[PDB]
DNA sequence: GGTTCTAGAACC
DNA sequence: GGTTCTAGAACC
């Protein structure tokens, strides 16, 4: 899955650690500081700089938001998207 | 309509001119610089600091986005929401 | 009603 | 398929 690969690789990079990273556990990820993520990182990895479209893709492939870390921190979770479970990436789709 | 009133009054204020204002015509409005609008102005007038919820309300009361001004500029339009047509505000609902 | 999360539909 | 606009549903 193209999206999941790009998502994982985005999280594989410590350059972004401050604004996008894995949750301490490693079973969810956090996006925080929408200024720099939306305007700088989204367009690096994707074809837009629009957070709502990033969110849509996450719901499209069966991520859910978690109901923190920073102030404007968004946390999403898929049961099969984890820091160590790197093989399960084509095992996530819709 | 509570939303429309608050929307109009938000646009009635030149403090915000740089980040939220009427379109030159006066028949649509522009929101631009999501940093300052979302984090500073949304919470002044509404019960959140979440742009997507602002967008939802606009679609709920029959505003549409226009397909510019700045870079991350969002423009919305209702036929009956205009700078001079201030009386038509309860004539907008859903 | 307003806010939040998720999804439909349509265009690219 | 991905992106964009709009809307459904549910909780507050």
UniProtKB/Swiss-Prot annotation, chains A, B:
Highest rank taxon of the organism: Eukaryota
Compartment annotation: Nucleus
Outcome, altering residue 60 to M: Abolishes the binding to SSRE (SLN1 star response element) motifs in DNA, but preserves binding to HSE (heat-shock element) motifs
DNA-binding domain: annotated segments: 1-94
Domain remarks: Homotrimerization occurs through formation of a three-stranded coiled-coil structure generated by intermolecular interactions between HR-A/B regions allowing DNA-binding activity.
Annotated family: Belongs to the SKN7 family.
Assembly mode: Homotrimer.
Function: Transcription factor that is part of a SLN1-YPD1-SKN7 two-component regulatory system, which controls gene expression in response to changes in the osmolarity of the extracellular environment. Under low osmotic conditions, phosphorylated and activated by the phosphorelay intermediate protein YPD1. Also activated in response to oxidative stress, independent on the two-component regulatory system. Regulates heat shock genes in response to oxidative stress and genes involved in cell wall integrity in response to osmotic changes.
Name of this chain's protein: Transcription factor SKN7
Species name: Chaetomium thermophilum (strain DSM 1495 / CBS 144.50 / IMI 039719) (Thermochaetoides thermophila)
Organism placement in taxonomy: Eukaryota, Fungi, Dikarya, Ascomycota, Pezizomycotina
């Amino acid at each position: 899955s193209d999206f999941v690969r790009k998502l994982y690789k985005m999280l594989e990079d410590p350059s972004y650690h401050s604004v996008v990273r894995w949750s301490d556990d490693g079973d969810s990820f956090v996006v925080l500081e929408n200024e720099k993520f939306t305007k700088t990182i989204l367009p690096k990895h994707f074809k837009h700089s629009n957070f709502a479209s990033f969110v849509r893709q996450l719901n499209k492939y069966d991520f859910h938001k978690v109901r923190p870390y920073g102030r404007d921190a968004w946390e999403f979770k898929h049961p099969e998207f984890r820091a160590d479970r790197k093989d399960n990436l084509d095992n996530i789709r819709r």
